[PDB]
Amino acid sequence: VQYNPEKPARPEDHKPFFYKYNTRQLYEKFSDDLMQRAANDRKEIEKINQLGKYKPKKQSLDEHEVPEWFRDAKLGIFLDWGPWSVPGYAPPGSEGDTGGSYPDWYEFLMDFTYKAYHDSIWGEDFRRDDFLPLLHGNNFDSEEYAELAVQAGAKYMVPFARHHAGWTMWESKYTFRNAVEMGPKRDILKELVEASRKRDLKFGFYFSIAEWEYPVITKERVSQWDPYEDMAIFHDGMGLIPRPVPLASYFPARHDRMISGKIPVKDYFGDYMMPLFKEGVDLFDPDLVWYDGGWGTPANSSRVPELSAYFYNQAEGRKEVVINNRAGAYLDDKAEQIGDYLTPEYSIGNVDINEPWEVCRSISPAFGFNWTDNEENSLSSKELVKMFVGIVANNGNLLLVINPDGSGKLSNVQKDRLLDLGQWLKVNGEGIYSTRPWEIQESEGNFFTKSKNGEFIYIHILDKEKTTIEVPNLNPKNKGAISILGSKEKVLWENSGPITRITIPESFKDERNWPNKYGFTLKVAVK
């Protein structure tokens, strides 16, 4: 029952969590029915793709274009919440190759990289699924999360609808491992989509392709030591740590309490994943699909191309939609990809400025709550603004991860950063939303954007140690063509051959006279 979510550890009278049905019980009651229902959905998907514009082929899917709303959005919120939020930890030195830290991998890595921590803090008898009842979500207010996104200046919201251990934020007909059956006992994704739609936030559907473990029905026994000859555990390469592939032996006392709620199938992809995706799309009508966890199986074999075509086709002539690039390797036997935009993770890297892209990260290294995170290891508001503008100037969006604890509460450090960014965007948003890169992006610590129609150039000034700005080939319309967003203060400037030389007004030498203390923005009418 009781833990402090801000310093989470084993409760004093921990009892094991047994879902009303174990995995064999779920097999005996639900598997056949689920597999029949899945067969029907697959036929529906095939027909929609038959009738529709888009076919499950790269050639066909690549012709879909990034919508204007996505290019114009610039800022999204990535709502990284789930059972992993309860322990809310990754240890020092366990960073991924991205450079990020992954508390949101705790459910898997508790038996591996994070096991020393788990053994001492939670106990060796505390299983993955024991976290599910502890994810009560009593401070999780879906209305306030949508409002916070708005107040942060975000134009889209992507909750972690279903991550790699298979727990769905929505009430599903294809799994009892869902938010109504387990944890907060409410349809969290439904609350969030309703809260988002009534605020004009675009809504993204985050969907893990593979899962770390899934119980499957087999035609032969895996080994002679197995209690069941008709059942196994399915893996692909998603977990990165080598496991038996495709099948591991199934042992109830080992597996049941890391797969609570999951109904066995013969075919993980066809019988479970495909219809679960369809259900999410059909129920929630997302504007965006954010695939993840598809590096373990080629997109050809996982059948994600059919899901991508479906998503496009059920939207055609209703709304413009977009998909990320994480469907997996697209082969025709590195590989190629499908999807509308690249998703560099934590570290921006070398980006192609010609095509819109999206970086995902939180204000710290953490993907998922880390209870040890605080002001000193997180971005300052100043650093966040600076980082955001740099992203936008280079044709990117920021999908800003936020990391609530097991109660669903967001730390003040994270709240304050979001509200400071949003308050900066309230003033300077005209130089951000619906902008495109200019022929210069960054110069002398100043950042440039242009309005998509080309009438205005914006210059974001973040450093109070500045007096003159020299901009080659700016070409202001007339001597009154330069102003400051959110201010009446007149900007004096002169041309000097090709270079425009701007003197910062006297009052703006001190950043307490700025409309917003984290930066001011010059608006330049050009032509």
Next chain:
Amino acid sequence: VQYNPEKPARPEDHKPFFYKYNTRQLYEKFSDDLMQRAANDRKEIEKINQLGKYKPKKQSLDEHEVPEWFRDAKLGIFLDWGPWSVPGYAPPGSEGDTGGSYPDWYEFLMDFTYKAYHDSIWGEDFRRDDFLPLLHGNNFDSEEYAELAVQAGAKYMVPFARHHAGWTMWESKYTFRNAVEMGPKRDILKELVEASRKRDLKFGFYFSIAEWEYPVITKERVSQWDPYEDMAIFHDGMGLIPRPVPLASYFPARHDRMISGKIPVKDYFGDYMMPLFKEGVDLFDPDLVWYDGGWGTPANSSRVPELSAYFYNQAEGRKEVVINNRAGAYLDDKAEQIGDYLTPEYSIGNVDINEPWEVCRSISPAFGFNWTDNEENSLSSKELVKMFVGIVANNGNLLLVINPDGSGKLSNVQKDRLLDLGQWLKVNGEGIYSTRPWEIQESEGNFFTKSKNGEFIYIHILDKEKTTIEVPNLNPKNKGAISILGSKEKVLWENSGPITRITIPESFKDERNWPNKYGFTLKVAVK
């Protein structure tokens, strides 16, 4: 400290077992030295095989013949004792394809098939290596074990020198996972070899080829989640349950306390197994090598042919020696085998009567102590005698497994069966030792053997409901050519064309007048 070995469960104040060195410490201190020492041993082995009669080739090894002493022995004792003896359990329904039950697989299957039992009875925090201090061996008297083998009528003794988790009954220079460092704190194999030699028992060296897990040194990291980039866990297919092959990621909090004492190497076979085998052979000068655990790697790749040639070669001119057939599949890339005799396990199956073979089993299904075993699920003395004679008549030896508890004490049920068999053999042993199959083996519940020279036929009579024995083509020498071992009672008989008809003396109708109550034996001087 305290458990009841006859009903073993988690001690009351269990503390974790940490060997003075963990796996990284063993790597830093000992690995280099071990790998240099291994290099020297490998050169020694290569030279011995270079200069010697036998080469590491099937053609060469197959020319070695089963020694007369093995064919003449008939009965051996298989001393199945180790860390697994402490928990002393396998659950119902977990039988191998052999039909046997394997408490001696507990160390592995505690995380798999036997995990339900282990979780409730020992606890999820109780690791494999926690059993090692509990194997105190305070009732393990090596002198009495050798004497018991003699009193059972056994001619050879095969202790479980090293089983699949790698714990050596001898003090080794190639592992700290040995009987002196861990468990009874004495050189158990040394005690047993000395006790055996002074009783003229032949001595067998039981040696597992593969182990379930071994820490190995790598040239690159297995996954990005690994704490060490220079280390992994090596597996082959020996465990049967699929594992990552050849390498799994290594995690100290997961692995260290199932591999206590084991010094990491680059090459499991070359750097560890080969020199450990050599050490055992050189130190103990065994008459017999009993390989096991070689079905996970072909004999070609494990390099066991070189060990077989070595063993033969270091014995040439000193003693006649023998090897079983469990080196592994012999290929030249359904496969062939090397070794001197077949080893059907638990169930005899279809045997080739033309070549000597050996069946291994205990008086119950169990390989390894099962604390729930008792009189009612074990062979009676009568059934054991009957089973033994059937084996011998078909050209087999019985390698009779005995199963002590964690204190090293053997159950009375097991002791009584052995003493009854030995007492039957004391009387009737002339019809067993140094015998060969006759043209009839079993007929009408009677069993036949012949002396190896062909002078005598022996007929073992086990059922008191018998008055006449009719034997085709038994040609007795003269009218006084038939007697009863251990008795002066005259045996009357008549020929009737091809058939010899023997009347059982009046007194022998009741089995209380038999020299031994479990059977009497006719001795027939023939042509």
